[PDB]
Amino acid sequence: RLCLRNYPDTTWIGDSRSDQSRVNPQSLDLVTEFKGVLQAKNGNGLLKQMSGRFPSDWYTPTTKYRILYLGTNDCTDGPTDMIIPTSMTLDNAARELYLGACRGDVRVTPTFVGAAIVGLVGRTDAVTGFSVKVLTFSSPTIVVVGLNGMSGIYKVCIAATSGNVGGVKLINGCGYFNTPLRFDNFQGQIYVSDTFEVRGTKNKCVLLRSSSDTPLCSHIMRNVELDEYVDTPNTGGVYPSDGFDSLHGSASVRTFLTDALTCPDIDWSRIDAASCEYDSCPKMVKDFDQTSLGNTDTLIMREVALHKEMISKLQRDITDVKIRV
Amino acid sequence: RLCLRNYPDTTWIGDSRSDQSRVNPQSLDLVTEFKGVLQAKNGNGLLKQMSGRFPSDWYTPTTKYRILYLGTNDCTDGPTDMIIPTSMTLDNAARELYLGACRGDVRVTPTFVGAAIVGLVGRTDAVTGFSVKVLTFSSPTIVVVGLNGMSGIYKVCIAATSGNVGGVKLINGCGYFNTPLRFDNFQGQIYVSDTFEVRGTKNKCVLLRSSSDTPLCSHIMRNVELDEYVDTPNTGGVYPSDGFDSLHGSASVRTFLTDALTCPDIDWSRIDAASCEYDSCPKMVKDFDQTSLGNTDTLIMREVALHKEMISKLQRDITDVKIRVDAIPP
Amino acid sequence: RLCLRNYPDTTWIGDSRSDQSRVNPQSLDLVTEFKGVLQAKNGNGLLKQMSGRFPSDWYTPTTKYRILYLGTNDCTDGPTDMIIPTSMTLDNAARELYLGACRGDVRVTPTFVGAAIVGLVGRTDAVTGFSVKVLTFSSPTIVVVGLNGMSGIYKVCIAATSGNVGGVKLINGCGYFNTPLRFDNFQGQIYVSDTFEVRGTKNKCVLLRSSSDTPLCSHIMRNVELDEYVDTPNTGGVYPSDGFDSLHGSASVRTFLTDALTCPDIDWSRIDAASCEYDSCPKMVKDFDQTSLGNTDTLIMREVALHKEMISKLQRDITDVKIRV
Ligand SMILES: CC(=O)N[C@H]1[C@H]([C@H](O)[C@@H](O)CO)O[C@@](O)(C(=O)O)C[C@@H]1OC(C)=O
Ligand SMILES: CC(=O)N[C@H]1[C@H]([C@H](O)[C@@H](O)CO)O[C@@](O)(C(=O)O)C[C@@H]1OC(C)=O
Ligand SMILES: CC(=O)N[C@H]1[C@H]([C@H](O)[C@@H](O)CO)O[C@@](O)(C(=O)O)C[C@@H]1OC(C)=O
Ligand SMILES: [Mg+2]
Ligand SMILES: [Mg+2]
Ligand SMILES: [Mg+2]
């Protein structure tokens, strides 16, 4: 019997299936109250948070413990999200991001961007199809992103008419980076996301499987390799067909999550973990009920009083007979 | 009897009356130790935090629970804080802010701002009367603030010599916004505050009335409409006259807050709430003291021991009689 | 016997000796699991974090309680870090930083920087010797840093060919500031760190002595003046020689920290403090075992049963004798 830590020192990191504040309840999988901090956004993921579609909805857990139930939306990242030469693979970017949300002491901070000329700051939907901040460079220049010693991941998207990275001609599209970069001969527009900083990694989580309506992309499928992974109800790896639609509201997922979050009388303060098996979880101590012991004392005192009375009467009775003797 | 959650998973969100580390005690209303995180700044409020007067003192709760005791300072926002055309009203901006502090998963982050030409970054007191970061545009241009899809509120203040929003001529002053905006033909200076982001809203709070020495402005008065609102001592709606001055140190408010924060032996870990009525609060389990039960056993044992020998003596006394009677000739 | 708060509402603020996720265990002094949030980074300090060496590793506690075990690395700040005219002294900068980490409601945020002309944003190792974000001004101008009313500390480093502060000629190097500044006639490059904001100061900490392999610099030695200071094992004030090297892994420091973090059955939820002496710490409540009290009742009930039998016989015997008389 799985018991998930349902407690104020825990952050639930989710997508629409957990976005209790903003999603029609029919599409929710998390339908029980979560006593911790809920960070869940319809459409979002640990990669998608860097796209610019949800500019105010970055995940920023600050608690010791986390429970993750997301990933399906990150499967909409594809070849064009790792097409800039020298970008990380999606497999590697996703592994670092899921490690950070699960275990990391994390921050979301502005990413350094600069250049040999002043770039024009604006916003446009021309680079990604939706509105994001960009720098526009009207002549070819050196463009720099990130700083030596950084520890985190940021996303870049370009619409360049010229440029190269270390002599390799750039390709328009996006990439993930966890090191500083330098573009030479760059002209055009550049989008740079904030940095998901991942520093120490001694926080703790459960990673609940997030299933899609088709088999998972490789970079999310690989979350199965993390010690914290826990399976959730699925049909051959695909989201069950017992929900509001093919992707939300699964009756069986709802039951799995509600049961695990409502284990009775667990003293979460006594275990350093984001979950435990019910028989092993520490239990709340209750007030001792002394009613039985008191009833026993009272009954004993009653009978001893009776004996006291009988003894004195037999003493008088013996005296009565000896007087007669 | 009201019990307020006094626990490390709670943030107290306040102004001078709770700013224990920086305000003379004669002016405090929170005069008892708060076991949670204290974020309280003299002169500040959820609107005023966006003004630029207190550039390092934004409210940034990150805990599940909150207790709010502020609002009086937000009544210094007025018509000139909602005068930029298309600005939110103060009623709606404050509603969104107080909801976010109370229930929100919130952040404070830099607000996007850009333009069709490069703006000059500086600081000045010419826009608001005190020093804030501004962009100066010396020729008319397109100015853009915020991004589609954003979820939060930011403040804008302008000192423009030309410009319009959607063809409506700009008016100098400030406004609050929770959507991106675009100014055309803009020349002059623009201040843009950071964004108070409000995302999910499943955190929990109590909202304690913050009274002024005059009747509350409408945008703070409407906080009474929120489920979390709790009245605090006041005289016809105004701060009581039993304090250090007309706005601070009320004896009766102090007693109200101290009493509510010192309920004995509440096990806050067992209730998912920022307050409870005392009789309904879960109580700490304490070690059982068995001394009285042990005393009762010992008292009983002493008397039973006496009985053993009393009985022994009656047995010998009877047997004497039996033996003596047996000798009666038939 | 010292007991340190080992609980999810506590942040451990450390350097390599506590950097469990990134440092070989042989160099750790914190070798036991910490149930709170661990923010510890090799080479770091509350001053060194602002140097530009740690762009993603600023300390950002958000918990009520903290335990600090750092300072040794801050002793490499020296005269060149307080050489810009009107800079704070290192003594005063460190005092404010350690008080803020210990007691503060703190944030790390971008520091305002502006000028009378547009500065060129780039990165360079020319100002500090390693790559950081800078503005370049190729003609003389007014440069402004920070804002009136700010509450925190930031670091500035310059490589200027001209400039003054209030008519005092600038000197190249660094300085710490907790107020806005204005440079006139400035030409060259300027690095400005993020601001370590310190607002209210009602959070609570223990400040564990951090020893170096030589006597502490003045600005860290003075942490002994804080109420929260607690000595850790040392030899004449110097790091003990019983470790992996002269700066890490002390057997006696390890035992000191492990012992203090493993006090049994402390109910930290009942004490508003980052530490307590063992005998005074509140202890976890355990279920009461009533077995001995029940055994006592049974022993009594047995004897009372016997007395009932003996009284009955006494009654029979007195009746018999009376029958005869
Ligand atoms: C680089 C650029 O000129 N972006 C413009 C942008 C773009 O032309 C469209 O493609 C939408 O992307 O549209 C706007 O109407 C907009 O509201 O976002 C104005 C933007 O102007 C500035 C200064 O950012
Ligand atoms: C836009 C502008 O030039 N602002 C200046 C500001 C201004 O004179 C107003 O406050 C008028 O009162 O004052 C300063 O002395 C100041 O210390 O903030 C320097 C500022 O210079 C720069 C480059 O930002
Ligand atoms: C101001 C400047 O020109 N900085 C350059 C920087 C610098 O030359 C020193 O680090 C070498 O001493 O080096 C680079 O190769 C680098 O990869 O960081 C590119 C930087 O370019 C820009 C526009 O920031
Ligand atoms: Mg495994
Ligand atoms: Mg109501
Ligand atoms: Mg008994």
The answer to whether residue C296 is domain-embedded is no
The answer to whether residue C263 is domain-embedded is yes
Q: Which of C106, C79, C315, C306 is nearest to C174 (CA)?
A: C79
- Give resolution, Å, one decimal: 2.0
Q: Measured between CB atoms, which of B21, B52, B287 is closest to C285? A: B287
C16 part of the active site: yes
Q: Which residue of A has its CA nearest to B105?
A: A39
Cα–Cα distance measured from residue C73 to residue B95, given in angstroms and rounded to the nearest whole number = 47
Known binding residues of A for Mg(2+) are 297
- Domain identity same for A71 and A217: yes
Q: How far is CA C219 from CA A245, C75, C212, C222, in A?
A: 63, 8, 13, 6
Distance spanning both ends of chain C, measured CA to CA: 79
What are the tokens at C275? 């530490």
Half-sphere exposure of C246 (CA within 13 A, CB side): 5
For residues B197 and A56, the answer to whether their CB atoms sit within 8 Å is yes
B286 interaction partners in chain A (CB closer than 8 Å): 287
- Domain identity same for C36 and C176: no
Contact A60 B201 (CB under 8 A): no
Contact A35 B64 (CB under 8 A): yes
Tell me whether residue B297 is annotated as binding: yes
- Domain identity same for B123 and B199: yes
For residues C131 and A147, the answer to whether their CB atoms sit within 8 Å is yes
- Domains held by chain C: number: 2
Residue C144: CB within 6 Å of ligand 2?
Answer: yes
Chains B, C: CB pairs < 8 Å: 133
Contact C123 A147 (CB under 8 A): yes
Residue B159: CB within 6 Å of ligand 2?
Answer: no
The ligand with the least distance to the CA atom of C142 is 2
A19 interaction partners in chain B (CB closer than 8 Å): 200
Pocket mutation for ligand 1, best pick of B148, B150, B182, B184 (most atoms within 8 Å of C-beta) = B182
C113 interaction partners in chain B (CB closer than 8 Å): 121
Name the catalytic one among C81, C193, C248, C250: C248
What are the tokens at B167? 């063809």
Residue B126: CB within 6 Å of ligand 2?
Answer: yes
Strands (E) in chain C, as ranges, are 2-4, 10-14, 37-40, 65-69, 106-109, 113-115, 120-124, 132-145, 152-165, 168-169, 173-177, 181-192, 195-198, 204-208, 229-230, 275-277
Please tell me the distance in Å from A285's CA to the nearest CA on chain B: 7
The answer to whether residue B93 is domain-embedded is yes
Helix (H, G, I), strand (E, B) or coil at C67: strand
The answer to whether residue B55 is domain-embedded is yes
For residues C169 and C204, the answer to whether their CB atoms sit within 8 Å is no
- Domain identity same for B58 and B84: no
- Domain identity same for C104 and C183: yes
Measured from the Cβ of residue A286, the count of other Cβ atoms closer than 10 Å reads: 11
Please tell me the distance in Å from B325's CA to the nearest CA on chain C: 8
Cα–Cα distance measured from residue B97 to residue B108, given in angstroms and rounded to the nearest whole number = 12
- Domain identity same for A71 and A215: yes
Measured from the Cβ of residue A204, the count of other Cβ atoms closer than 10 Å reads: 21
For residues B220 and B94, the answer to whether their CB atoms sit within 8 Å is yes
For the four alpha carbons of B43, B48, B53 and B59, in that order, the dihedral sign comes to: positive
Q: DSSP character for B46?
A: T
CA C179 to chain centroid, in Å, comes to 25
Cα–Cα distance measured from residue B243 to residue B27, given in angstroms and rounded to the nearest whole number = 8
Buried residues in B66-76 as b, exposed as e (16+ CB within 10 A): bbbbbbbbbbe
CA A305 to chain centroid, in Å, comes to 66
- Domain identity same for B143 and B89: yes
Contact B22 C200 (CB under 8 A): yes
The answer to whether residue B165 is domain-embedded is yes
Structural domain that includes position B169: 77-203
- Domain identity same for A72 and A211: yes
Spatial strand order of the sheet with B204-208 comes to B37-40, B10-14, B65-69, B204-208, B229-230
Q: Which of B39, B44, B41, B46 is nearest to B66 (CA)?
A: B39
Q: Give residue C34's identity as a one-letter amino acid code.
A: F
- Domain identity same for B72 and B84: no
The answer to whether residue A290 is domain-embedded is no
B55 interaction partners in chain C (CB closer than 8 Å): 112, 147-150
Cα–Cα distance measured from residue B146 to residue B14, given in angstroms and rounded to the nearest whole number = 28
A275 part of the active site: no
For residues A301 and A31, the answer to whether their CB atoms sit within 8 Å is no
Q: Which residue of A has its CA nearest to C291?
A: A293
- Domain identity same for C179 and C86: yes
* Test mutation, B15, B41, B49, B57, chain C, max C CBs within 10 A: B57
Pocket mutation for ligand 3, best pick of A118, A135, A182, A185 (most atoms within 8 Å of C-beta) = A182
- Domain identity same for A82 and A150: yes
**Residue A138 burial (C-beta neighbours within 10 Å; 0-12, 13-18, 19+):** exposed
A285 interaction partners in chain B (CB closer than 8 Å): 285
Choosing from C285, C300, C315, the residue where a domain stops is C285
The answer to whether residue A106 is domain-embedded is yes
Q: Measured between CB atoms, which of A55, A314, A325 is closest to B321? A: A325
The ligand with the least distance to the CA atom of C159 is 3
The ligand with the least distance to the CA atom of C297 is 6
For the four alpha carbons of C43, C46, C48 and C51, in that order, the dihedral sign comes to: positive
Cα–Cα distance measured from residue B159 to residue B225, given in angstroms and rounded to the nearest whole number = 35
- ∠ Cα A277 A281 A284 (to 5°): 150
Closest residue (by CA) to atom 5 of ligand 2?
B124
Report the separation in Å between the CA atom of B112 and the middle of ligand 1, taken as the mean of its atom positions: 13
Closest atom of ligand 2 relative to the C180 alpha carbon: 17
Measured from the Cβ of residue C115, the count of other Cβ atoms closer than 10 Å reads: 19
Name the catalytic one among B125, B245, B317, B320: B245
Cα–Cα distance measured from residue B266 to residue A78, given in angstroms and rounded to the nearest whole number = 52
Residue B122: CB within 6 Å of ligand 2?
Answer: yes
C19 part of the active site: no
Closest residue (by CA) to atom 9 of ligand 3?
C124
> Locate tokens 């490690």: which residue?
A99
The answer to whether residue B157 is domain-embedded is yes
* Test mutation, B37, B42, B267, chain C, max C CBs within 10 A: B37
- Domain identity same for B253 and B280: yes
Choosing from B268, B285, B302, the residue where a domain stops is B285
Closest residue (by CA) to atom 13 of ligand 3?
C124
